[PDB]
């Protein structure tokens, strides 16, 4: 399979399954993509430079593994209990995108399973992340600014060029992670799991 | 020259009356030392403090270049402003005691100034350091709780094997200092300048944890 410059109808792939196709400057906004699953798939063009606009899809427990994403444009998502694995998603947008459950509790809560991916530069700002599989990424240069992701579990994370102090990491596990410029004097790390080698690392920071 | 197994009460000390010599095993209740010169002078097994008058002496502006305490029992001493460059209190108990203005500074031999002083073993609580310069210094295994250090400087000091329970970090300055084997208290790495100073092991685990790691 291998679409190139469609915009896609709201029926056409829901709940359906998709292996090693390619989805080229494609336009997903709108559609319904509940219980979706790509496999092998790719949604970024090289020669073309873009990728495909995913804006306000319904997402609801869609699935994505071994997938190009980049420059995916998933702003203003429902995304709930959406799972994202071992997949390329450099430069997406995820400002808007809901993994929150508002409907069966009175309040709110999170689901979501994003691991083993690539989410250099991807911007989450203001996003809600709570207690969610955040395990495994590269977040080298994403934009975090007003999000948080409070009590998930970021463990084996790779944090080169990242602002700690943008977002909420209160209760997240950073174990076995690359750091970067973490600062444990600026940056409330109440509740985090850390790891001995990173303990001392951070120490040696402090001049210590 | 030496004395021994003397017991003096309420005098007053000559400037002379015991320069270079040394002393053991003997006590003078509220004697004041004050501008004595006691250069060289050993003091071994000795008791300024009387548990009955609750009174110390008066060190005040002596002159303590190479003075020796040693096992004494120095309980609210008054050094304030002496000198007391090259000095050594081991073993010895000093609550209370008032180093206010005491220059452990040497500011000929140099251009500018540098630091002597050896206080190790000894029992420091209550103790008054506000605005001692007190750098690069023996200062190991004594307890510090509750002294006051506003405005002191231990800086490159080797503090290690100490006692520091009710003690105000952010006091003083304690950059390049050695702190290990130490009971820290209540330090936070967040608020106090730890630039070059050393600690264990067990230590750093237990500064992460108040932080809540």
Same mark, same amino acid.
């Given at each position: 399979?291998?679409?190139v410059?469609e915009?896609?109808?709201?029926? &056409?792939? /829901?709940?359906?399954?998709?292996?090693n196709?390619?989805?080229?400057?494609?336009?997903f906004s709108?559609? +319904?993509?509940? #219980?979706?699953? %790509?496999?092998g798939? *790719?949604?970024? !063009? &090289?020669?073309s *430079?873009k990728?495909?606009? %995913?804006?306000?899809?319904?997402?609801?427990?869609?699935?994505?593994?071994s997938?190009?994403?980049?420059?995916? +444009?998933f &702003?203003?998502?429902?995304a709930?209990?959406? @799972?994202?694995? =071992?997949?390329?998603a450099?430069?997406?947008?995820?400002? $808007?995108?809901?993994?929150?459950?508002?409907?069966?509790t009175?309040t709110?809560?999170?689901?979501?399973?994003?691991?083993?991916?690539n989410?250099?530069?991807?911007?989450?700002?203001?996003?809600?992340? @709570?207690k969610? @599989?955040?395990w495994?990424?590269?977040?080298?240069?994403?934009?975090?600014?007003?999000?948080?992701?409070?009590?998930?579990?970021?463990?084996?994370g790779? %944090?080169? /060029?990242?602002?700690?102090?943008?977002?909420?990491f209160? =209760?997240?596990?950073?174990?076995?992670?690359?750091?970067?410029?973490l600062?444990?004097? #600026?940056?409330?790390?109440? $509740?985090?799991?850390? !790891?001995?080698?990173?303990?001392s690392?951070l120490? @040696?920071?402090?001049?210590?």
């Amino acid at each position: 399979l291998a679409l190139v410059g469609e915009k896609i109808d709201r029926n &056409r792939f /829901t709940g359906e399954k998709i292996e090693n196709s390619t989805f080229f400057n494609c336009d997903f906004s709108g559609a +319904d993509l509940s #219980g979706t699953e %790509f496999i092998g798939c *790719q949604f970024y !063009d &090289r020669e073309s *430079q873009k990728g495909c606009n %995913f804006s306000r899809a319904m997402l609801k427990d869609a699935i994505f593994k071994s997938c190009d994403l980049s420059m995916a +444009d998933f &702003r203003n998502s429902s995304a709930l209990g959406i @799972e994202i694995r =071992h997949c390329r998603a450099q430069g997406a947008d995820f400002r $808007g995108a809901s993994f929150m459950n508002m409907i069966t509790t009175r309040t709110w809560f999170c689901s979501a399973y994003i691991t083993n991916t690539n989410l250099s530069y991807a911007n989450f700002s203001k996003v809600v992340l @709570e207690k969610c @599989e955040l395990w495994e990424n590269r977040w080298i240069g994403a934009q975090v600014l007003g999000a948080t992701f409070s009590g998930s579990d970021l463990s084996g994370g790779e %944090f080169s /060029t990242f602002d700690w102090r943008a977002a909420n990491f209160t =209760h997240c596990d950073l174990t076995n992670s690359e750091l970067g410029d973490l600062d444990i004097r #600026g940056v409330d790390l109440q $509740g985090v799991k850390l !790891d001995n080698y990173q303990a001392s690392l951070l120490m @040696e920071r402090l001049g210590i």
